[PDB]
């Protein structure tokens, strides 16, 4: 993966509402800022219950958004990342409807997992209770195979039936997806829900040896087609390290909340610890298309004795801090859970989670860019967007607080703001200075300061982070200082908003 900043966006929520418009925005307004882009699911349909992640036909671009030729066109100027939903598919797919019609006579019967698929001999209460769950309840629902009531395996909504990733038909399906991506010049694949894609009795059916075997298989097929695979998993952080040593790339989901903690308390010891131990084959983010993950720093939710990177009280305090900084906006969008340790994500734009403090936000982005890994910027964050309460009240979908629809006009108006221009200049600095292609190091004081240094063949840079200097949501004191050396000698910026860095 190129070591350049990428954009995460919906095709229809950035510009006029099409892949062509999104491409035009990227090329005309973010040249040199975002040299790659992760296009969120744009298949048929993109506007269902789960904003494109519940496709009926994963292989056809929604004709309202564009075509695969548009993806091919975009690939000529940007590296493209796309999702591959490998664990399940719509119960409204033609295949599953065929299984409902013909049952075991269906050509696609072996393609879908049932309880009997995994437990041909019966299952114990321990067998079923031990399955790792993103949603409450057992992963089964009732469907009728031509007349016969069957329990279909469903890791998520009952409308998303899980496929047998080990069957010939299922694998054929996955490889059809891979063949289209490969045919439209996509570079990177984000394997959605891949950790659940392998089922085996007596195990958690989540990131087991079988799951890793599946991932490696998909990897070989990808490289055979020129597609690199990215793994997405929200889990207890130690499991994240473990998984990261076994795959090409994972997300760094701990950093966003770690930076919220640092900027709200001034403590940097957790950030230094995570820096020391984190997996470096990472994609770094602050905001995503989902809510802010708190489980990723995370007392283990199956065994609360394995403590996270901060005490549980600091986790509760983090959630409450987002609530306070947003003056209750996130409370309206987050479902209450009777205890903040039970929470999975907190629905708020990152900029809003910081109380819209420009200095804090630009500092967070700087840290993100200085840690090993490819940085991604979510489009809302690319425009320093606030919580969209109108859309939330319209749809009652919590996550929509962080999924504002930006018209071209709105984009151009927000591009005049100093913090946005500071982020653009910062991403240019991160994309153009070759120091970041060299070697990484860092120093720490005890709890006040931490300095990340990259040294390269023709440049060097050190970012010093000291949140202790600028406490307060209304604070305007810079909390990040930057020194770097390029063609023009040594340079220093003590305010990344007022004095964004420019490489010679
Ligand atoms: O399609 C369903 C969703 O898939 C992805 O989200 C995931 C993908 C995944 O592999 C695991 C999870 C985990 C949920 C979860 C985890 C731990 C827990 O304790 C409770 C719940 C979420 C997309 O990004 C999201 O937009 C989409 O809606």
UniProtKB/Swiss-Prot annotation:
The keyword Cell division does not apply. The keyword Transmembrane helix does not apply. Optimum pH is 6.0-6.5 for the phosphorolysis of sucrose. The active site is at 192 (nucleophile), 232 (proton donor). Keywords: Carbohydrate metabolism, Glycosyltransferase, Transferase. It catalyses: sucrose + phosphate = D-fructose + alpha-D-glucose 1-phosphate. Catalyzes the reversible phosphorolysis of sucrose into alpha-D-glucose 1-phosphate (Glc1P) and D-fructose. Is involved in sucrose degradation. Also displays transglucosylation activity in vitro, by transferring the glucosyl moiety of Glc1P to a broad range of monomeric sugars, such as D- and L-arabinose, D- and L-arabitol, and xylitol. Homodimer. This is Sucrose phosphorylase. It comes from Bifidobacterium adolescentis (strain ATCC 15703 / DSM 20083 / NCTC 11814 / E194a). The lineage of its organism: Bacteria, Bacillati, Actinomycetota, Actinomycetes, Bifidobacteriales. The gene is sucP.
């Amino acid at each position: 993966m190129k070591n350049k900043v990428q954009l995460i966006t919906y095709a229809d929520r950035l510009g006029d509402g099409t892949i062509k418009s999104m491409t035009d925005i990227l090329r005309t307004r973010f040249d040199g800022v975002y040299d790659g882009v992760h296009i969120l699911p744009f298949f048929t349909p993109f506007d269902g219950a789960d904003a494109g992640f519940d496709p009926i036909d994963h292989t056809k671009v929604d004709e309202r958004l564009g075509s695969w030729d548009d993806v091919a066109e975009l690939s000529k100027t940007h590296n493209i990342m796309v999702d591959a939903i490998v664990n399940h598919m719509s119960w409204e797919s033609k295949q599953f409807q065929d299984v409902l019609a013909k049952g075991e006579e269906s050509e696609y019967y072996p393609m879908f997992l049932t309880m009997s698929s995994v437990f041909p001999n019966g299952a114990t209460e321990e067998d079923l209770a031990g399955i790792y769950r993103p949603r409450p309840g057992l992963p089964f629902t009732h469907y009728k195979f031509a007349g016969k009531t069957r329990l279909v395996w469903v890791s998520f909504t009952p409308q998303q039936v899980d496929i047998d990733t080990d069957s010939d038909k299922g694998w054929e399906y996955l490889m059809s997806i891979f063949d289209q991506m490969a045919a439209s010049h996509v570079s990177y694949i984000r394997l959605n829900a891949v950790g659940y894609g392998a089922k085996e009795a007596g195990t958690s059916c989540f990131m087991t040896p079988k799951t890793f075997k599946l991932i490696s298989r998909l990897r070989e097929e990808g490289v055979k087609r020129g597609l690199e695979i990215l793994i997405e998993v929200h889990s207890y952080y130690k499991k994240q390290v473990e998984i990261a040593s076994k795959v090409d790339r994972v997300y760094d989901f701990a950093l966003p909340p770690l930076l919220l903690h640092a900027l709200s308390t001034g403590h940097v010891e957790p950030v230094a610890h995570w820096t020391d131990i984190r997996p470096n084959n990472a994609v770094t983010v602050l905001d995503t298309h989902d809510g802010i993950g708190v489980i990723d720093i995370g007392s283990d939710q199956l065994d609360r004795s394995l403590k996270g990177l901060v005490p549980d009280e600091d986790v509760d305090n983090l959630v409450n801090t987002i609530h306070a900084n947003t003056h209750g906006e996130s409370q309206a969008a987050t479902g209450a859970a009777a205890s903040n340790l039970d929470l999975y994500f907190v629905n708020s734009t990152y900029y809003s989670a910081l109380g819209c403090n420009d200095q804090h936000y630009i500092a967070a982005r700087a840290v993100q860019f200085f840690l090993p890994g490819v940085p991604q910027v979510y489009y809302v964050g690319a425009l320093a967007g606030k919580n969209d309460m109108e859309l939330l009240r319209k749809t009652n979908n919590g996550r929509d607080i962080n999924r504002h629809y930006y018209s071209t006009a709105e984009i151009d108006e927000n591009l005049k703001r100093p913090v946005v221009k500071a982020l653009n200049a910062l991403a240019k600095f991160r994309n153009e200075l070759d120091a970041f292609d060299g070697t990484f190091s860092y120093t720490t004081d005890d709890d006040t300061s931490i300095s990340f240094t990259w040294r390269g063949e023709t440049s060097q840079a050190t970012l010093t982070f000291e949140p202790k200097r600028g406490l307060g949501v209304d604070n305007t004191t810079p909390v990040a200082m930057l020194e770097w050396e390029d063609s023009a000698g040594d340079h220093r910026s003590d305010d990344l908003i007022a004095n964004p860095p420019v490489v010679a």
